[model samples]
Target: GELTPGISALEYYERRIRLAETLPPKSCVILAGNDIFQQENDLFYLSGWNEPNSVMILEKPTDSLSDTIFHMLVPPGVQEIFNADESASINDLSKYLPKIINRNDFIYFDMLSSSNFKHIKSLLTIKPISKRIAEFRKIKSPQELRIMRRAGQISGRSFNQAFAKRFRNERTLDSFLHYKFISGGCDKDAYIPVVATGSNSLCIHYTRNDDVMFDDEMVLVDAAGSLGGYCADISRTWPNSGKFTDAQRDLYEAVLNVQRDCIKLCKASNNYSLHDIHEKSITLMKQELKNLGIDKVSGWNVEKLYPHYIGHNLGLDVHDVPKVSRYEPLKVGQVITIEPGLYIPNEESFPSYFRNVGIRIEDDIAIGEDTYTNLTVEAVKEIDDLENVMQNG
Candidate 1:
């Protein structure tokens, strides 16, 4: 059975109820399972539901400690899967629960009525509450932070493997990379591995890995690790042959410099939001591009140089809460990504010297009280550091 270790189930439940109280009185907030990976797993963080189709519902209770309405929906055939000798019934498996939900036969309330909903609403509460729960998730717990840091460590290992060919002897780069993370002690990859080579790097989400390695090709790898539900997302672009040519080095350095400069500006109380960081990174990128003799960025061709935002929030989901927009000031405990890129697609309109050139340097960071922590520090980044790892490690 799943048992509590650091914090009790009651404490976890109380936390949720306190958060729920911040919602409208009549508000029935349901954090549904959007994806089995993030949302469904978030449920497990509270109640510990591990089966694929399981669902959980939590209603606002009167007393913060004891008054929470909890219910789980298990698929029909799951009972037969577990033996009767199991200490807990299929409905009461605590291993699947991060905490215990009180289920008393005498308790009952109005649940959401929908034949297709598949989960339990189970109860309705009186008096509309304010917006507290949403506010709570905005911040993270110390425990959550620990999980996220480990996730970052796993991501760093994956980054190193991709750049160093650590497990290429076992199988294809795709499966070999996956094994490296699982073997290195990650729950799984935060998301699908993005292993793009040569011109394929131009596409942001490319995952194809069947192509042969070329002597002069540049590989762009964007991968992360999932640990204890939280995740760490990272990316690194460099030459596949463990060395960058002069042109590749220049482009890579440009993106790296801009990313580092923007990250330095990520201090708490900086008054800059994620979008603000993106803009600052863009300013740096624009100057570099202009210095390289590429002017006229006022048109739709702006993407010809800078393609995506500077970074994103990293948490339970690879792209976590509070979507990206204008400069949101860096806050304590908030984890984010500071990725800046330069992509020059292959085309006759483009400079012949810069065709098929794309570079992105990304890192997972947690905003500290005064600064931020780069979780992927183990992944060699500096030119000297990278060279040392490639040659020695």
Candidate 2:
């Protein structure tokens, strides 16, 4: 029952129909499933089935049995072992496919491995449809929002519990969050747990959580879990010593303020592109650096310190699709992240007090017609609340 019962079968069928509509006349679309136990295939978005060696065929509208068809290519007797008696068998595919497909029809398919491409190429004229699918996944339905909301709750609670406990090292903290995520009803982590401390936090995608933490340093926990295929992506940085020093407090507040302003620009009415928000963040960061007296040194590049984009769309995948240019305007019903960070790691041009300090505050936001909803608000980001949690708990 990992599937969200709230999403009716009609919704899945409708998604396939919409994709079929995008095809040219006298064409068909084919999507192959991933190997079992591997990452869930993106094809699962249209068909709820997650079984391996499966395929979906969607034909152009015609006076036939159905416009969409699903097939499972399991070996004999394996269906009983895999408990997939509900799916259509491969033997049934040959009979059903001919009803809607003709020899001259163009076949559009998602990208597959060289071996897989070779196997399917002999069947029909192959054209790429990966971009089409990506475009369709950007705007999530109301049913998806419900699942994502629950995922946010699970991730927020996991962070709270992990921060409340005393852990010896970064690995321990990572494991603790994993325990809480599964126990809180999530299937697995949305992404690898980033439990970085001190200088390690300077690396944007740090995932080697195997370092000992000290009182003087800060721990950056960028972790979240997935529920029913929907994901929650959150990041929080807190002092290991349960209190922030003068330099740490100043740097943390600067990033927090910038993140808040960027989130305000995420609404549809603003017509603010992601690139626009990112540039605004950089401008704010430069001002913060000047206020902190770090810009006094020549050749100090503020952009180098804050290199990554402000945020990305979040949904079925941690970094969800549409793969559009950053200049494209964000639409309503899109869920995205607002993460602004500053990382200064032992640079000679940087102030001594701020060296080896990295801070990032992230939250999930659901875009709306007028404004946006902060989905991961339960995960505390305020400096006062963060310090209080570390001290009292």
Candidate 3:
């Protein structure tokens, strides 16, 4: 099998090469790979090794490949295949640090882990290497886009499965989603899914997924899958009875309209930051809510109605390169989610028909120079499409 699905072996070498060039002369960065997928991501991003407690050291002076040697604790065979300039045992790491510290301008390593190699944590000053590496991870390569596009396709189809037949409860539906992702060729669920039903959907990030879903209510599922260490985040809301109530219909359309507008603004040419898009989301939400007769109902509590940000950059992690500021301009090759949702609280102050109806529509978008690609387009959101899939199945 390939080191990473779709990513070329030379790409990994080039990643390491690129990181090597960014550092000042005599700066050595050491990183440890952990058992957790998210925790070990940085190490794996640099070198495709996932062995637990493994450590790698990358040094500067890129003029010579030997000067950019990476010390690995894995088998010589694995290291040889990855083309490491040098290889050493995990046991040798403790003794190896002193030489690196004395010869380098400074050492850079993430402070995320210290259990395996606690001694190094206290030995010398360590600057964070996270930012530079994230710069590389932020942009999607052509091959990465292909994997993400496939992930969107399979995960979107998986969401459609939920609408095909209503599960009795949130738990059953959650299980069905996980099964569909794997069966559809995804590695696994991207994160603990949000399978909130009815009023439970009012609580953002709801993952208990244990309530009995009623025929009269709607289920809001915020989930997707990870394919090849890359992740896609999606959210879909559908009625449990396979038919929307008048309120569900109106609320769903409002949010969907806002989502469509935001997706259109996702291009790099727009020069909009995540914050800028979010600002547009608020204005759009305000107009939509007023048209739905919720104006000043809760004192224009925009925060309460649409609590979360418009979306986030999605990739190896659900919120990829988070340190990449949301205030920065959107750029080409960055993949982001355009999720706009409305959660109406069941309060008498609000309109009766719209109360307690929580709805969210999300899609992953691949940013381009002048436009964007809707990666999760297969997930049906339109009224006719949703009803058609459910009615037939």
Candidate with the greatest TM-score versus the true structure: 3
Instruction: Provide the lowest-lDDT 10-residue window in model 3.
Output: 111-120
Worst 10 residues of 1 by lDDT: 77-86
Taking all chains together, each candidate's TM-score versus the true structure is 0.78, 0.89, 0.95
Model 2 regions more than 4 Å off: 1-6, 61-88, 91-104, 111-118, 122-125
Per-residue accuracy of model 3 over 1-393 as CA lDDT, tens digit each = 367776777878888888877777778888866643454677788777756767778888445655777767642376667667777776776687677778877688766544555656766556898887888888888888999999989999998887888688999999998999999989888888999989999888788889998888888999898888888899999888988778889899999999999999988999999899999999999899888878577454777799889999888889889888889998899998999989888788877887888899999999999989999999999999999999896
Flag the better candidate by TM-score, 2 or 3.
3
Cα shift from native, residue 127, model 2 (Å): 3.5
Models, CA RMSD each: 6.5, 3.5, 1.8
lDDT of each: 0.62, 0.76, 0.84
Best by lDDT: 3
- The per-residue C-alpha lDDT of model 2 at residue 77 equals 36
- After superposition, candidate 3 runs with Cα above 4 Å error: 36-39, 62-66, 111-114
What lDDT does candidate 3 reach at residue 390? 91
- Could you give candidate 2's per-residue lDDT for residues 329-377 as a string of tens digits? 8888888899998988687767788898888999998888998888888
